[PDB]
Structure 1
Amino acid sequence: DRDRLRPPLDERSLRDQLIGAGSGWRQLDVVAQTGSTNADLLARAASGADIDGVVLIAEHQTAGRGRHGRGWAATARAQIILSVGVRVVDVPVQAWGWLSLAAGLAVLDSVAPLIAVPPAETGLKWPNDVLARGGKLAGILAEVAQPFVVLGVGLNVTQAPEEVDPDATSLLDLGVAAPDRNRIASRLLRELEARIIQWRNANPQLAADYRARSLTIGSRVRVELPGGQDVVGIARDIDDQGRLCLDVGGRTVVVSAGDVVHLR
């Protein structure tokens, strides 16, 4: 399995092209490597640091995660990995579930313009995954540390397969030949900033847009919740609380968050 090299993210470019003036991005760093962009930001938080609008990107990550929960093994520059701090305390606590939803929407937005022709099943899997042709293209990890939330984005641009990562998919696989990570990071952050603003405003557009690109709605899934608990039903729609309206044989189950696995 040969593989290596790849272009490096230019921090100086992303900085002066994304930080300050009008943008809601206060600060940006690129590191060669870390365990979890989320964990580190979660830590600046706990150290006193205002991480509102602070962006942190890793070239490589041993195990994407943080406060609670481990991770897995990946490969260097095979993907875009970044975290952003978001002040959430001014928004109704019942609405925080939408953040991870917005983030996944923002990723898909950043990427779609790259594909010449829409592939098979490619959209959003409630509540944390961006899929393309039924593979995991991107993962979204939302974590809370009042008055903050950290949004982690792991996006498979190059590849870095295939055990984490057990059925994911990289842009290359969707026929994008020479994806520029910098251009992508820049768009993704622009999409993110926008979606966040919407979320803060309780824009109804945010939910319609989500439902519009939802692969989960209309189909039949298994929702893996904490432990060996699993629910199988048909997703009808989501509520204003970013929760899944799940139709289990005629009876509705409203699961807040958790893993899903499209069956139908």
Structure 2
Amino acid sequence: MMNFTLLTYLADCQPKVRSELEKFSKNLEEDIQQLREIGLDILVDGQDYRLVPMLPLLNPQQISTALFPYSIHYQPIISSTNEWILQNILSLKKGDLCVAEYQTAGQWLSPFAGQIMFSFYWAFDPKKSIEGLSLVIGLAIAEVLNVQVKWPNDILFDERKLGGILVEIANHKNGMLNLVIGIGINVSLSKPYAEVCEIDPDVERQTLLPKLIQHLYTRLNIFEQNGIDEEFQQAWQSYNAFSNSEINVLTEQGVISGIEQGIDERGYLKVLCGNKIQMFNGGEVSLRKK
């Protein structure tokens, strides 16, 4: 069982003596070791216990001044960035974000401060359709990092997953379509996955996070107008790593083989299997390469 309070107190990544630490944990050394097992690195030098970040910690006010006017909440340790946006939905506007260094619920040995992890609140017209939204989120991320996309919502470098996207619908009666979009991008992971450190060795999470968020909001606004138009489908093809490739579509009824044929106006995957094009929805099916 993870000691959440101990992790939160150690989150500043500054040294803390056991006299204070013994308050948050009862059997302390058993809990420090349990945190070490889940991939966190707590090093005790002499009498000083310190948590080690994989990358330099983020500065909240630097992000806030860079992403004005969007309101930013920074928590070093949180259960879920999506839950905070959901739980505080009544106090937020478009683009308000919850950025964290570690998510306790969610890689397995995921590192503290090794990922760009943020969630944000977005609203659409209640009539509007969100079909293809996860494709817009992925394409924006791929364009910023000059990497590839995989349908429906995978970001790829060297055919390896560089991050993940989670789009959720809030059960709030705003008269609008309320969505929490969650993003995790691997920057430096301790080690079938990829990290931005490979593509850009001198990358800094402080600069990349506003860059990604700004382009993401552009494409979301483009989606509100253009939809999944022909220009978007051309943009998808440019960054698709599975374009016109021999693919296997894993479905609840088994695997359908064929050749990838891009996307339609609803964001559905188009595959040529036999002599007909078969279309699939993202949540129901999974994409792989023969």
Q: CA deviation at 1:143?
A: 1.4
For residues 232 and 160 of structure 1, the distance between their equivalents in structure 2, rounded to whole angstroms, comes to 35
The answer to whether structure 1 residue 18 and structure 2 residue 54 are counterparts is no
The TM-score normalised by the length of structure 2 is 0.72
Q: 2:132 aligns with which of 98, 104, 123?
A: 98
Equivalent residue letter for 1:55:
L
Equivalent residue letter for 2:79:
G
For residues 100 and 196 of structure 1, the distance between their equivalents in structure 2, rounded to whole angstroms, comes to 10
1:177 is matched with which residue?
201
After superposition, give the CA deviation of every residue in 1:94-148 in whole Å (9 maximum; x if it has no partner): xx12221111111122222xxxxxxxxx411001111000100121111122621
Q: Assess if the C-alpha contact under 8 Å between 2:79 and 2:103 holds in 1.
A: yes
Segments of 5+ residues of structure 1 without an aligned counterpart are: 21-25, 65-70, 113-121, 162-166
Report the number of matched residues: 233
For residues 61 and 132 of structure 1, the distance between their equivalents in structure 2, rounded to whole angstroms, comes to 23
Q: 1:2 to 1:60 in 2, by over 3 A?
A: closer
1:249 is matched with which residue?
274
* Correspondence 1:91-240 to 2 at 5 A: 92-93=128-129, 96-112=130-146, 122-145=147-170, 147-161=177-191, 167-174=192-199, 176-202=200-226, 204=229, 205-225=231-251, 227=252, 229-240=254-265
**What SS is found at the alignment partner of 2:121?**
strand
Q: Assess if the C-alpha contact under 8 Å between 1:195 and 1:206 holds in 2.
A: no
Segments of 5+ residues of structure 2 without an aligned counterpart are: 1-38, 42-51, 172-176
Q: CA deviation at 1:231?
A: 3.3
* Correspondence 1:63-78 to 2 at 5 A: 63-64=105-106, 74-78=110-114
After superposition, give the CA deviation of every residue in 1:67-104 in whole Å (9 maximum; x if it has no partner): xxxx95521011101111110234522xx122211111
Q: Assess if the C-alpha contact under 8 Å between 2:233 and 2:262 holds in 1.
A: no
Q: Assess if the C-alpha contact under 8 Å between 1:220 and 1:263 holds in 2.
A: yes
Identity %: 24
Q: 1:109 to 1:145 in 2, by over 3 A?
A: same
How big is the alpha-carbon RMSD for the aligned residues of Structure 1 and Structure 2?
2.4
Larger relative contact order, structure 1 or 2 (CA cutoff 8 Å, min sep 6): 1
Q: 1:179 to 1:84 in 2, by over 3 A?
A: same
For residues 101 and 116 of structure 2, the distance between their equivalents in structure 1, rounded to whole angstroms, comes to 7
1:35 is matched with which residue?
79
The TM-score normalised by the length of structure 1 is 0.79
Q: Assess if the C-alpha contact under 8 Å between 1:41 and 1:51 holds in 2.
A: no
For residues 17 and 55 of structure 1, the distance between their equivalents in structure 2, rounded to whole angstroms, comes to 13
1:119 is matched with which residue?
none
Of the two, which has the highest radius of gyration?
2
Q: Assess if the C-alpha contact under 8 Å between 1:104 and 1:128 holds in 2.
A: yes
